[PDB]
């Protein structure tokens with residue numbers, strides 16, 4: 001029963017927790033509650049082998065900058081997340097998350113995850129973004145960012161529709177074995 | 178004592194130094210029944226701490242502070258106006274006053290530590306937490322077994338072997354008898370181990386044939402009625418205890434282990450003594466050379482000792498004060514002319530101010546042995562007391578009680594929450610190697626103190642120490658605010674020459690007894706003799722849990738562990754006991770022969786015969802059964818002043834557990850005597866089955 005420690009990081013509100021809850025319970029959270037720290041598990045079959053997947057949820061709020069890293073020791077794989085409809089969270093992948101993860105775990109595999117895929121083509125969100133002088137992050141951008149931080153994989157998904165969701169965790173597992 | 182929901186719900190903290198330099202996120206909780214304080218790491222791994230093992234809780238500035246720079250940074254401690262002090266929590270645990278473990282937690286939220294510290298301590302210090310019935314302790318075992326699961330969410334069979342280590346064979350056979358997997362590397366589904374399956378498992382592992390004999394005398398509701406009125410004296414029970422209007426032997430076992438059948442008159446554990454009598458009319462829990470953690474000549478001194486003794490209700494502590502060297506000129510506390518380490522006088526004051534009234538609201542006496550031959554440092558001493566103790570310090574006599582001849586001392590109530598300083602206010606001088614040479618064996622450094630200057634003198638009122646001259650001299654002066662201190666040797670000598678006057682002296686004034694200088698090993702002297710004479714401050718070395726301290730902790734647990742016990746009215750005004758040691762359960766973690774000793778501590782005219790059980794029939798320690806005749810203590814004159822000692826030892830004399838119980842607090846009948854450690858803390862596994870009978 002091979003165990004794997006997967007830590008999920010990224011700006012606050014990018015959808016990290018919904019990512020974990022939707023994946024482990026196939027249910028989507030009904031109330032947004034900022035995370036301090038949490039843990040979820042899941043036994044999964046990957047390439048014909050049972051794996052005990054430990055999912056470590058972290059705080060996106062910057063008030064936890066010194067405390068957050070306390071969950072990093074012995075991490076097998078990191079999921080750096082950013083919202084596909086939040087250029088700010090995308091920029092922080094390079095300005096904050098990548099450097100923070102590499103500082104504490106220089107050799108640990110990283111998987112870049114673009115979240116809220118369902119909203120990229122959503123009309124309401126776009127108008128809202130246009131009013132904010134913004135626009136969604138495109139796949140080519142995501143892929144390019146992944147190359148820049150040396151991510152083993154770039155993956156987009158939606159916790160809401162679950163499209164691309166399971167793939168994220170299968171790859172996270174395969175990045176370790 | 179009910180466990181508040183938020184405690185069981187849990188709170189997020191960062192536990193540090195559980196390793197070194199390692200800070201670990203955890204969710205801290207107290208199970209619904211108040212048995213354990215346990216934290217869960219992100220990896221799901223759990224760590225348990227018995228509520229009964231906790232000695233204190235601290236938050237804010239009183240919490241332990243991290244030293245390593247790494248942790249200092251993690252917690253932003255070197256940051257201007259941070260809020261670290263609003264997040265610190267420290268839980269102190271340990272088998273005694275010295276062997277301590279500090280569990281340090283830092284919360285994410287602000288101000289939650291205070292609630293946790295106060296609520297957890299209230300559970301710990303609740304009299305009924307330590308004095309629950311046998312069934313409660315057996316239940317703590319079950320809760321533990323079912324709470325400590327593996328990754329598969331099951332109970333490892335290995336955990337049963339660790340819980341009941343004396344004989345694996347018998348444990349294996351017990352699991353099998355309950356159709357459960359017997360096998361180093363099996364796990365049991367928790368739903369397969371509920372009550373009464375656990376109960377059946379216990380009955381199989383620990384058969385109770387002696388209880389079957391009680392039946393020889395099922396059991397109808399009528400018989401049970403006869404039993405309770407004849408044996409346990411001076412239908413709902415059957416429904417509650419019978420596993421399946423008849424009571425089976427197993428049902429009898431659980432009933433006898435239940436709360437309705439307590440060996441103690443539990444109301445006695447609560448603060449119920451009349452606290453309005455004069456101070457010298459009470460026995461006062463006292464500590465000698467409090468600052469020492471070991472050894473009188475070699476060993477370390479620690480301000481923490483003050484916290485520990487005070488948290489147990491000690492009301493009289495000692496501070497040996499010595500001058501500090503320049504450039505600081507800071508007074509210190511140590512055992513002069515030895516190799517014991519030093520602590521600053523100031524830290525002792527800070528330790529005392531913190532813990533003084535956490536577990537008892539009644540007055541404390543600070544016995545100063547002053548060797549500070551420096552008016553400036555003595556002024557520093559007085560200053561530290563006034564400023565740190567603040568309003569707690571009694572700086573002047575009470576209006577209703579002037580320091581005049583014929584006036585009695587105030588009562589514990591009149592001095593509630595007050596700290597009294599015992600210091601000189603007569604020969605004085607500095608000690609010499611030679612001067613301590615011929616005192617070392619008796620009075621020690623206490624044999625000579627320096628003169629008290631103005632600053633310190635002003636702080637003394639109701640506890641003025643003067644060298645003893647004679648009982649008639651004392652009676653002549655008629656001053657109730659003067660205290661006389663004697664070594665165990667001097668006090669014993671006085672009892673052999675003037676017992677009548679010593680007894681009368683204690684009705685008017687205070688006498689403090691302390692160990693002879695020859696006890697460099699910090700051993701203690703038996704206190705009974707002195708309490709019998711009315712001596713109120715019988716100071717012992719709290720760091721040494723030998724018999725005298727075993728009895729001291731036991732008797733002062735009563736009256737709400739306030740540290741005060743009202744003397745019998747015959748000591749203030751100006752029955753036959755039989756115990757049969759029947760059997761014992763899980764007495765040792767290993768299979769060894771065991772024996773029990775029973776004796777009485779009381780007045781000179783009380784029964785003095787001592788009893789020792791025959792060795793247990795074999796190395797079976799799970800359920801040994803003895804064949805002893807009743808151990809009798811005839812004509813106990815004053816039950817109030819006497820206590821019964823029941824101690825369990827394994828062959829070879831290693832202490833396993835005991836109970837020392839004042840006679841008036843004992844209930845009669847068949848009982849499951851839950852055993853305590855030397856420091857009087859409740860033990861989970863060991864217990865004795867006994868039969869008590871009181872007659873006039």
Ligand SMILES: Nc1nc2c(ncn2[C@@H]2O[C@H](COP(=O)(O)OP(=O)(O)OP(O)(O)=S)[C@@H](O)[C@H]2O)c(=O)[nH]1
Pocket residue numbers: 010011012013014015016017018019029032033034035036058059060061115116117118119157158159160161
């Ligand atoms: N439309 C859509 N909304 C999503 C999706 N995933 C998350 N959200 C929404 O995003 C908001 C925040 O998501 P959440 O998972 O709580 O963020 P977080 O990163 O865990 O935030 P923190 O814990 O660092 S502060 C919630 O209101 C949630 O409903 C998604 O895939 N699609």
Ligand SMILES: [Ca+2]
Pocket residue numbers: 466495497546622623
């Ligand atoms: Ca001394």
Ligand SMILES: [Mg+2]
Pocket residue numbers: 016017018033034035
């Ligand atoms: Mg969240």
